[PDB]
Design an enzyme around this catalytic site. Structure first.
Site, PDB file in Angstrom:
ATOM      1  CG  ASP A  54      23.489 -26.025  -5.311  1.00 18.86           C
ATOM      2  OD1 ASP A  54      22.809 -26.132  -6.130  1.00 18.86           O
ATOM      3  OD2 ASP A  54      23.918 -27.020  -4.668  1.00 18.86           O
ATOM      4  CG  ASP A  81      19.081 -30.337  -2.781  1.00 20.41           C
ATOM      5  OD1 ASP A  81      18.475 -29.552  -1.458  1.00 20.41           O
ATOM      6  OD2 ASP A  81      18.357 -30.884  -3.341  1.00 20.41           O
ATOM      7  CD  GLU A 112      22.083 -33.514  -3.114  1.00 18.50           C
ATOM      8  OE1 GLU A 112      21.114 -32.942  -3.778  1.00 18.50           O
ATOM      9  OE2 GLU A 112      23.315 -33.196  -3.057  1.00 18.50           O
ATOM     10  NE  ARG A 135      17.739 -37.052  -9.250  1.00 12.95           N
ATOM     11  CZ  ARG A 135      18.280 -36.068  -9.160  1.00 12.95           C
ATOM     12  NH1 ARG A 135      18.891 -35.815  -8.091  1.00 12.95           N
ATOM     13  NH2 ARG A 135      18.533 -35.094 -10.161  1.00 12.95           N
ATOM     14  CB  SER A 154      17.833 -25.021  -5.513  1.00 13.82           C
ATOM     15  OG  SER A 154      17.547 -26.193  -5.405  1.00 13.82           O
ATOM     16  CG  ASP A 198      27.009 -29.903  -3.991  1.00 21.22           C
ATOM     17  OD1 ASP A 198      26.006 -29.175  -4.618  1.00 21.22           O
ATOM     18  OD2 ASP A 198      26.888 -31.204  -3.986  1.00 21.22           O
TER      19      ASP A 198
HETATM   20  N1  LIG Z   1      21.336 -31.190  -6.010  1.00 24.65           N
HETATM   21  C1  LIG Z   1      19.953 -31.291  -6.335  1.00 24.65           C
HETATM   22  C2  LIG Z   1      19.426 -29.846  -6.429  1.00 24.65           C
HETATM   23  P1  LIG Z   1      20.574 -28.242  -6.264  1.00 24.65           P
HETATM   24  O1  LIG Z   1      21.792 -28.815  -5.554  1.00 24.65           O
HETATM   25  O2  LIG Z   1      20.819 -27.556  -7.573  1.00 24.65           O
HETATM   26  O3  LIG Z   1      19.781 -27.066  -5.166  1.00 24.65           O
HETATM   27  C3  LIG Z   1      19.423 -32.430  -7.134  1.00 24.65           C
HETATM   28  O4  LIG Z   1      19.923 -33.531  -7.728  1.00 24.65           O
HETATM   29  O5  LIG Z   1      18.113 -32.351  -7.735  1.00 24.65           O
HETATM   30 MG   LIG Z   2      24.063 -29.089  -4.677  1.00 20.56          MG
END
Ligand SMILES: N[C@@H](CP(=O)(O)O)C(=O)O
Ligand SMILES: [Mg+2]
Ligand SMILES: [Cl-]
Length: 295
Positions: A86, A88, A95, A131, A175, A243
């Site tokens: 992952d 973010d 994020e 979002r 991601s 996560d």
């Molecule tokens: N958590 C992110 C993307 P990621 O963790 O999969 O890289 C989101 O809420 O858009």
């Molecule tokens: Mg993440």
């Protein structure tokens, strides 16, 4: 059928003191005790005929109060040959969606959606659409502005990826975020490949939409499948680390799946947890010694 338990501290709170090692070693009635990094990680070759259910308990209780993670596994097949990670909140500290939200004045509003998405209380895809909609009219300049001023790398991450590439492992940054971020972050950390979603723009501004079909929980599982066939392996040869709920498919499917500093409901669901270490924890999970790392 031979086991091994591993204890991991955060290298910035290296509390796995030599006396704890021995104590834990003897709580599970173990023979060898092998140090992967002085005061950070140690291998406890388990004794045969001990379900990891017990060795976990023995070690978690013996270690209680200390900021030291416990994982138990089989000694063979520990070194994976695929890493799928992952982005973010796992490899960067932020994020990417919530930071762009600052640039529209709605960081707080969007971060609460992000929180609920990453807990699994809402599906990833409508969460992304909702979002991202609020980013409409944002100029394209904001991308590099956020990358340069507010994005930082999670400790241990370059070391983790560089050290597996040194041992012939394919590393993918997979991601639910945006290709304009993952393309830079992956080259910056050292991945072979990245795959994320894509913001749409008119040539100046962000449209406020994302290229459909959106990559979500399922698309991370498939990228894992695609990569494994492509490299002559099965997903059993992979280690996956994230996560949020959108990583649960890939964490559950990989041979070694790691909930790293995971959200409440997510860690509740994962078999292997890292709540104290940084990204080097995954090297110690794989049985690497600090000697074997890339500096
Ligand atoms: N958590 C992110 C993307 P990621 O963790 O999969 O890289 C989101 O809420 O858009
Ligand atoms: Mg993440
Ligand atoms: Cl993008």
């Amino acid at each position: 059928v031979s086991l091994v338990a591993t204890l991991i501290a955060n290298p910035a709170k290296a509390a796995l003191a030599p006396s704890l090692g021995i104590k834990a070693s003897a709580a599970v009635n173990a023979t060898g005790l092998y140090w992967l990094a002085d005061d950070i990680a140690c291998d406890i070759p388990l004794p045969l005929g001990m379900e990891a259910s017990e060795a976990d308990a023995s070690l978690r209780a013996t270690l209680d109060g200390a900021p030291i993670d416990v994982v138990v596994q089989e000694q063979e097949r520990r070194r994976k040959k695929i890493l799928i990670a992952d982005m973010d909140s796992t490899m960067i500290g932020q994020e990417c969606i919530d930071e762009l939200a600052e640039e529209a004045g709605l960081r707080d509003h969007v971060a609460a959606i992000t929180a609920r998405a990453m807990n699994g209380e809402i599906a990833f895809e409508p969460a992304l659409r909702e979002r991202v909609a609020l980013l409409k009219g944002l100029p394209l300049s904001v991308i590099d502005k956020v990358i340069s001023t507010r994005i930082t790398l999670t400790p241990g991450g370059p070391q983790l990826v560089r050290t597996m590439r040194k041992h012939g492992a394919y590393t993918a940054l997979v991601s639910g975020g945006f290709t304009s971020f993952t393309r830079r972050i992956a080259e910056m950390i050292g991945f072979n490949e990245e795959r994320a979603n894509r913001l749409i723009d008119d040539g100046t501004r962000l449209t406020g939409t994302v290229a459909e079909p959106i990559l979500g929980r399922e698309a991370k599982v498939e990228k894992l499948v695609e990569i494994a066939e492509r490299v002559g392996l099965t997903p059993e040869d992979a280690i996956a680390v994230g996560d949020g709920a959108n990583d649960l498919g890939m964490i559950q499917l990989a041979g070694t799946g790691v909930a790293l500093h995971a959200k409440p409901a997510v860690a509740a669901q994962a078999k292997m947890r890292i709540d104290h270490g940084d990204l080097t924890a995954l090297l110690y999970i794989q049985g690497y010694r600090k000697a074997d790392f890339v500096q």
